[PDB]
Structure formats: C-alpha cells, structure tokens
Amino acid sequence: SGFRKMAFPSGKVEGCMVQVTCGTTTLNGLWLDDVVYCPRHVICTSEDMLNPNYEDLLIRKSNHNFLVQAGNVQLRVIGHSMQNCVLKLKVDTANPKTPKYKFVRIQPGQTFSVLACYNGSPSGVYQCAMRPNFTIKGSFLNGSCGSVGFNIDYDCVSFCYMHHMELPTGVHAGTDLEGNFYGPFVDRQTAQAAGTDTTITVNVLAWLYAAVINGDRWFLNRFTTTLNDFNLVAMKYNYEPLTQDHVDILGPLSAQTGIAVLDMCASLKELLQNGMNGRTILGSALLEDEFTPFDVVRQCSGVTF
Amino acid sequence: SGFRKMAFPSGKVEGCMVQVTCGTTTLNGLWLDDVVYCPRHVICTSEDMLNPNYEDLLIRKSNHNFLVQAGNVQLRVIGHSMQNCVLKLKVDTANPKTPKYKFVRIQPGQTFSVLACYNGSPSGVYQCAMRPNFTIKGSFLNGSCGSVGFNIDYDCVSFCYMHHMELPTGVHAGTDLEGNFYGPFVDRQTAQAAGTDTTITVNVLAWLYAAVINGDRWFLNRFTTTLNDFNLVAMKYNYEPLTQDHVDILGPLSAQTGIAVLDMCASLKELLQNGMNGRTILGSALLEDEFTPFDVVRQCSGVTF
Ligand SMILES: O=C1C[C@@H](C(=O)Nc2cccc(Cl)c2)c2ccccc21
Ligand SMILES: O=C1C[C@@H](C(=O)Nc2cccc(Cl)c2)c2ccccc21
Numbered sequence: 001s002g003f004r005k006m007a008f009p010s011g012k013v014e015g016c017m018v019q020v021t022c023g024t025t026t027l028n029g030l031w032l033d034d035v036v037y038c039p040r041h042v043i044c045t046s047e048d049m050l051n052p053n054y055e056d057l058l059i060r061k062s063n064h065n066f067l068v069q070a071g072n073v074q075l076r077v078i079g080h081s082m083q084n085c086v087l088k089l090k091v092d093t094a095n096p097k098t099p100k101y102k103f104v105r106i107q108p109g110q111t112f113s114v115l116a117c118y119n120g121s122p123s124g125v126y127q128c129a130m131r132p133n134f135t136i137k138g139s140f141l142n143g144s145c146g147s148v149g150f151n152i153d154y155d156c157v158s159f160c161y162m163h164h165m166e167l168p169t170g171v172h173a174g175t176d177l178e179g180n181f182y183g184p185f186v187d188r189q190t191a192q193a194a195g196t197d198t199t200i201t202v203n204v205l206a207w208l209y210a211a212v213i214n215g216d217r218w219f220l221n222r223f224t225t226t227l228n229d230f231n232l233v234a235m236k237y238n239y240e241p242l243t244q245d246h247v248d249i250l251g252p253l254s255a256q257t258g259i260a261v262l263d264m265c266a267s268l269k270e271l272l273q274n275g276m277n278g279r280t281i282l283g284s285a286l287l288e289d290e291f292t293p294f295d296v297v298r299q300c301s302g303v304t305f
Numbered sequence: 306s307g308f309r310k311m312a313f314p315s316g317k318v319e320g321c322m323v324q325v326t327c328g329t330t331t332l333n334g335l336w337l338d339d340v341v342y343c344p345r346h347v348i349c350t351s352e353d354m355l356n357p358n359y360e361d362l363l364i365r366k367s368n369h370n371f372l373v374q375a376g377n378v379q380l381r382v383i384g385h386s387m388q389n390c391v392l393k394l395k396v397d398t399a400n401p402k403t404p405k406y407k408f409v410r411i412q413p414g415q416t417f418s419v420l421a422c423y424n425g426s427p428s429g430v431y432q433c434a435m436r437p438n439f440t441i442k443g444s445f446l447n448g449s450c451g452s453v454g455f456n457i458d459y460d461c462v463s464f465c466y467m468h469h470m471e472l473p474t475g476v477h478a479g480t481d482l483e484g485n486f487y488g489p490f491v492d493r494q495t496a497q498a499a500g501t502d503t504t505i506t507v508n509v510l511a512w513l514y515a516a517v518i519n520g521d522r523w524f525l526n527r528f529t530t531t532l533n534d535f536n537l538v539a540m541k542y543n544y545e546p547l548t549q550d551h552v553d554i555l556g557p558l559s560a561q562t563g564i565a566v567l568d569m570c571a572s573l574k575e576l577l578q579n580g581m582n583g584r585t586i587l588g589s590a591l592l593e594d595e596f597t598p599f600d601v602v603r604q605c606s607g608v609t610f
Contacts, residue, residue, distance in 0.1 A: 001475045004444040006429035009420065011316030115314065121609035124311035125430060137588065139309040141607040170306045170520065215475065275583070283442065285590035302446040304426035 003210050003282045005290065006299055007113035008152045010125040015097030018075070019120030020089070020146065021067040028117045028146030029068065029089070030159070030177075032098050036068055036075070036089040037177060038146045039164050040082055041187050049189040058082055063089075069120060070095075084179030085164065085187050099157045103177040106160040108132045109200040109240070111292050112149040114161070116140060129290040130161075131171075132240060133197040134183025138163070138172040148177075152305045167192055200289040201239045202246040205264055207288045209253035210296045211281050219281060220259070223266040230265045237272045249293050308515050308587045310595065311604055312418035313457045315430040320402030323380070324425030325394070325451065326372040333422045333451030334373065334394070335464070335482075337403050341373055341380070341394040342482060343451045344469050345387055346492050354494040363387055368394075374425060375400075389484030390469065390492050404462045408482040411465040413437045414505040414545070416597050417454040419466070421445060434595040435466075436476075437545060438502040439488025443468070443477040453482075457610045472497055505594040506544045507551040510569055512593045514558035515601045516586050524586060525564070528571040535570045542577045554598050 020029040022042045029038035041049070043057045061080070066089050068075040079090035106112065111129045115122055116139060128136050128149075140147065140163060149161030164174040164187055171194065173185040185192055212220070231241045247261045254261050268287075276285060291299075325334040327347045334343035346354070348362045366385070371394050373380040384395035411417065416434045420427055421444060433441050433454075445452065445468060454466030469479040469492055476499065478490040490497055517525070536546045552566045559566050573592075581590060596604075 001446075001471065002442060002444040002477065004431040004433070005310060006421070006431045006444060007312060009316075009319050009427035009430055010314045011319040011427075014314050014316040116311070116607075118607045118609050122314035122316075123607055123609045124604070125314055126309040126311045128309070137307060139307040139311060139604060141306075141605075143607060166306065172307065278580070280591065283591075286585065286588075299429070299444060300446075302421075302423045302428055302448060304423050304428045 001214050003214050003299065005127050007125045007127045008150065009305060010113065010115045010122065012099040012152065012157050013115050013148065013150055014122050016095060016099070017115070017117050017120050017122060018068055018070045021069075022061060022065055026119060027143060028120055030146070030148055030162070031068075031070060031075070031091070031095040032101055034091050034094045036091055037162065038087050038089070039162065039175075039187070040085050040087050040179070041145070041164065042087065051188050051190070054082065058087075071120075082179075085175050085181060086162065086177070086179030100155050101157045101159060104151075104158045104160050105176045105178075105180070106130055108134060109203060109292070110160075111290060111295055112151050112160050114138060114149045114163075115147060116144055117147045118143045127290065129200060129203070130182060131197050132200065133194045134185075135167070135171040135173060135194050135197070136161070140166060140172055154305060167194065169194065196238070199237070199239045199287070201234055201242050201268075202249060202293065203289040203291055204239075204268060204287050205242075205246075205250055205261070206253060206293040206296045207282065207291045208264055208268060209250070209257055209259070209293075210291065210300065212257050212259065213296075213300055214282060216281050218279060219267050219271055221267055221270050223270065224260070224263050225266040225269055226262065230262070230269060233269045233272055239272075252297060253293060306519050308519050308604065310432050312430045312432045313455065314610060315418065315420045315427065317404040317457065317462050318420050318453065318455055319427050321400060321404070322420070322422050322425050322427060323373055323375045326374075327366060327370055331424060332448060333425055335451070335453055335467070336375060336380070336396070336400040337406055339396050339399045341396055342467065343392050343394070344467065344480075344492070345390050345392050345484070346450070346469065347392065356493050356495070359387065363392075376425075387484075390480050390486060391467065391482070391484030405460050406462045406464060409456075409463045409465050410481045410483075410485070411435055413439060414508060414597070415465075416595060416600055417456050417465050419443060419454045419468075420452060421449055422452045423448045432595065434505060434508070435487060436502050437505065438499045439490075440472070440476040440478060440499050440502070441466070445471060445477055459610060472499065474499065501543070504542070504544045504592070506539055506547050506573075507554060507598065508594040508596055509544075509573060509592050510547075510551075510555055510566070511558060511598040511601045512587065512596045513569055513573060514555070514562055514564070514598075515596065515605065517562050517564065518601075518605055519587060521586050523584060524572050524576055526572055526575050528575065529565070529568050530571040530574055531567065535567070535574060538574045538577055544577075557602060558598060
C-alpha cells in the first residue's frame, strides 16, 4: 500500500541525452538513431530572443557550427533541418543506446515523467500533468531546454514533450517531438497569455479511488448525483466537465472498489462545497489532479518496464 | 523556477536489479560486483513468517537453491551468507553495469530515491524521507521487497535502504545494505510499534526558503523568535527541536534569501499557530518536510550526475 507521485525509471532516456552548443548557447538534445533533436533557439543570441527570425538565423549556421557531445564523446554532424520549433541534426553514428521509441502528442490532462537535464547530463526525474491550458508546472532552470517528457509501456518509450520556455508567470511551455508547441505559445521572450486553467476532474476522481484502495475513506458519503448536477458544481469550481467517456475510463476503479462513479462524484461535490475541514487524503490537504486512472491502476497493480 | 519532489535519475541502479527466487518466493536483489544482496526472508514460506528461525531455514538451503536472474540471464551462485537481515549471494560473474557505489547508513530526516521493482524489473522512482521514527511512507506492493533507496553524488551511488516489510499500519520498514533495520523492527509478520513520529523541522524551514526563492512569499511576517521560544512551539506541534547544527546547515539558504533563520522560524511559528487560511505554498496546503536543505540548493542550482 501507499500512494506516491511516481515517475518512470529514467535509464532508457538517460542514454539518449546529449549536449548541443551553437555559438555561445548550450542546451540539451535527444539522440535517437542517427538524429539529434533539440530546441531551435540554440541558434539564438540574447539580442535575438525578443523576436528571432529563425529562418534567417539558421541560414547563417552550417553543420560544423553545431557541437554535439555525448558524455565525453563528440558526434559528427552531417545534416541539419528545422521542423517547426525543433532542429534535427543528422549525425554519422546511430546512438547504440537507442530504446524502442515513439513520438506521441499527448492530450491535456495526461501525465508523463520529465528528466531534467543540464549540459546533456541528468539532474532528476519527476512526474507531472499537461495542464488543460497546455502548460506544465515543472522545475526548470536556465540550461534545462531540451529536457524531455515521456511515458514507458513495457520496453517502448513514448516521447511526448521537449522543454522550451519558462513564461513570465513561472509555468513551463514546450513542444511535441515534431516541434509543435502545446498551447498557443511561441519561442520568443515575450509575455504570452496561457488562458484559464481548470482542474482535471477525471484525475481527481481517479485519486479518490486510489485513496479508497489505500484505506483513506473518510470522505465517502451517503449521497449520489447526476452528470448534469455534478457538472454544475464543476463549473462553479473551475473543474473540467465530466463526460461519459471519463466515466467509462473510471470503470475499472469503480469495479475494484464497488463505488459507482456518480457516487464518487457526489463525494467530490461535498469536498468542493465543504473543503477538507483540516483533514488529509493520501498525505494531501488539496484535491490532487496529477494522476490519471491509468496511473492509479498501474501503481496499485505493480506494472514493470 | 518551480519546485518539485524530484528523484535521482535511476539508470545506474536499474542496471543492478535482479530477481531472486528461493523455493516459491520471488523478490528483488541488488547485483554489485560479484555479490547479490537481498532480504533474507526470500527463504521463508507463509508458515514461517509469524516468527522464522532464519538460521535453521538457511541451513536447509544450498547455493543451487537460489535462482538469480538478471533480465533473461541466469547467474551461477557459488556462495551464500547471511549478514543481519540480508543475504549475500556470491556469483561467478561481476555485474558489468556496476556503478561506483558506497553503502551508507542514513540519519532520520534525510531523503533518498526509491526504485520500486517487481520480479527484478523497475516499475517507478520516487523521493522520500526517513521518518524520525525510522519508517518510510512508500508505495510498495507484494513482491517489492529488495527494492532499494539511494542518493547519487556525481558518479557515485550511495545505497542507504533495502525494502523488507509493510507494517500493519501501512508504513514501510527496511534495512541498510548491511542488513541492519532502521528502527526497532524485525523481519516477521507481527504487529510492531513504530512509536511517535515528528515533523522534520529543518526540512520544513528548507522548503519555506525554497518557496521564497520561487516567489511564494505571503507567509513572511514582521516577527522574529528565539531557539528557546520556537522550540516550545515545536514541542506543542510535534516538531523536532531545532538545534544550532540545523541553523548552521540552513546558512546558505539564509544567505541567498537574506532572511535570518530565526526570522524564518517566526514565520513557521505563525503558520503552525494560525494554519494556512486556505492558502498554498509551492502547490501544497500542508507544511512539507521531505526536502532537506541540501535538496533545496541542489534543485535550485541544477546539479547533475
Ligand atoms: O525553464 C527555463 C528554460 C529557460 C527559458 O525560459 N528560456 C527561454 C525563455 C524565453 C524564450 C525562450 Cl524560446 C526560451 C529558463 C531560463 C531561466 C529559468 C528557467 C528557464
Ligand atoms: O511493502 C510490502 C512488502 C511485502 C511485505 O510486507 N512483506 C512482509 C510482511 C511481513 C513481514 C515480512 Cl519480513 C515481509 C508486502 C506485502 C503486501 C503489500 C505490501 C508489501
């Protein structure tokens, strides 16, 4: 028993991290097969960041201007191309540590592990969620750009996130591995609206099921509700509306616990309306929304990679 | 910016995990050089667990009774010995993936990463603290025994914890890598008192400094206190007494922020006495005690391994 915010084991990804330098800028890249992927803003100077002309800046660069180092080992760059907001540096050596992998574009409310890196070297790993507003609440310093987010299924790493930017509000923005930003963001040093966030309702419900499995049951009540009634409450409290698709995804946890999804919604409604009265659930005094239903089952059933 | 409960990158440790089977019991072991370390209760049956005679049970076992498998690869066992509550299985092959490593016995209130494993395969990684009462609040299912906790400094893994047991209270107990339990616990299926826990005061203060660095400043007040006055409050709220050694360890964070340690103690005193009034600090509605002062600096300064 017990319930923790658990990340994927990071080893498969650690073997793909390299350092990329262009001029006086160093950040991280991801070495898969004979391609290194990194944020395109490695080519910028400080005077460029206000609104870089990336096409013009990249024209000034040649293969030999990109220094790519894998531990102590220098890689030879034989092509470069820009795809959306990422560069792809073709190298003459396939990464011998390449895992089975996929590039995926994840949906808001899904979770993944981030391997924070500096100078192509891993510093730590943590789990987070893609917010409904397509930001992430990470832990990232200067030099972290190019760090990646991922999920693992058996032996296959699905890469979903590459870090690009900290917004002036202190939350984080980045792209999929084809260089497309999540959200409306652009890679320049400007104030940029993220727009209203909401709490991930289906994840909160998943975590309440995890609480029950773990014996934290005090918040279970004598009430039920309807999707319509609950969604009125969801609206007031800036929660995502719950759909039947969400109910369907919660089915396995409902079955395990014997607690109908709408009964659990009625518990959540009461917590929203009354607060926690100085109590905790799974070690938290807030309602936690960074665990998906898949996350809860995986952790509660001991799936390995 | 941002502050997360970040684990060490787990790759160096993933390469040391193996499966150990003895009779009908399977758990995890740690393969370093030509020794595999695992919990001694791998030799028990269900009828033994109430109070195993480990010496007598082990006499019945020979080298060939210990099946050790490293991925798909079977290791040949050429010696066995029991040290305290661990077995050491000598194998004929040094682990080629052995990192630089040390065995350390950590102090209560220190933190480490746990790599949860089943059948010798990694499932996830998370950070936690050794509680003042020498328990850990982990996430562990049947089959997790032999999973390890560790810290990394540059290229050296310091192993501090091996998982043995979930107590009836749902918290976790285990040993150092010489097989000595943390706390009063014994490896048998009995109710066992853990005794009063307390909150790790120096860690709470460290996290309040992390909050300030990150711009969460609302809890800073106009007050100061003394060690004596603060410790009276600590007592009432089941916090560890603060010592000058703790003040000394908080020195670097005091200097960074310009906030005297006893001023920060006065902030904490007010939070203890008044609660948070429905506010949050670094995403938490409780006072967090699982970050050491070293943790805060490391995360806030981007140290890599
Ligand atoms: O998390 C990050 C990445 C780095 C960043 O924000 N770069 C940046 C800033 C504006 C525009 C563009 Cl394209 C990149 C940084 C600098 C300081 C602290 C944290 C962090
Ligand atoms: O976290 C653990 C390890 C495993 C355990 O508790 N084993 C055990 C139980 C009593 C005595 C001794 Cl020596 C070992 C377990 C079983 C069920 C759920 C969680 C967990």
